[PDB]
Symmetry: C2
Subunit: 126 residues, 2 copies
């Protein structure tokens, strides 16, 4: 449908594909930022489906942590989101460090895992 849960998961899925394409073009910073966004929407979908809500990146990340058991997320899964956020902050707002191919691939693979787990949690792996 056109409900928020469906559209969030669809947005997360599209962003994962966009990030894959950025990676192949060698746009490693852009890949990291997009991959974080995919995870953000997936997190928001999980919070929606389980009657929680957030209005900030940090708020969203901590709620995911708090609700991990119910959501079927491991501690590593929750760390995937924290780390992707921190790396997105560097990609979008940092001016000294450049992001390597190897960092970007790490975040991309984390996004794939995190978004799949989100789909599982909200019964959208359908």
């Amino acid at each position: 449908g056109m409900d928020e849960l469906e559209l969030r998961i669809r947005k997360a899925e599209k962003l994962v594909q966009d990030a894959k394409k950025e990676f192949e073009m060698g746009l490693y910073e852009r890949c990291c930022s997009t991959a974080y966004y995919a995870m953000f929407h997936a997190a928001k979908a999980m919070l929606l489906g389980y009657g929680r809500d957030s209005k900030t990146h940090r708020g969203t990340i901590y709620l995911i942590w708090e609700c991990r058991e119910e959501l079927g997320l491991s501690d590593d899964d929750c760390s995937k989101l924290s780390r992707a956020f921190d790396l997105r902050e560097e990609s979008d707002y940092g001016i000294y460090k450049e992001v390597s191919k190897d960092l970007a691939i790490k975040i991309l693979k984390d996004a794939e895992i995190f978004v799949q787990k989100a789909k599982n949690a909200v019964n959208k792996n359908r």
Copy 2:
């Protein structure tokens, strides 16, 4: 040098090129988001060079408006930034609307103009 003014302008310039490549791959939402980031860093460079500072997107946008005369920016130039921010919000955080090729090209061309004007203002068109 490795000073903030130089690195901000360099970041803005790189982001404009990244956005051009996203556009060519057909990643229209990603293009808009990247183009806004280019303009953001260019705005921060102009504020730095003219002894002002900001800590929010909206704060940055309003300071650019306030300082436009001194910066050599037209009202349209300031509207380029406001609109690019609003469209970046839709590209990154919206879940209903998709961004067309024609919107993305508009924002891309605005970023090119805005970043050049920023370079002029801070004497980095060198």
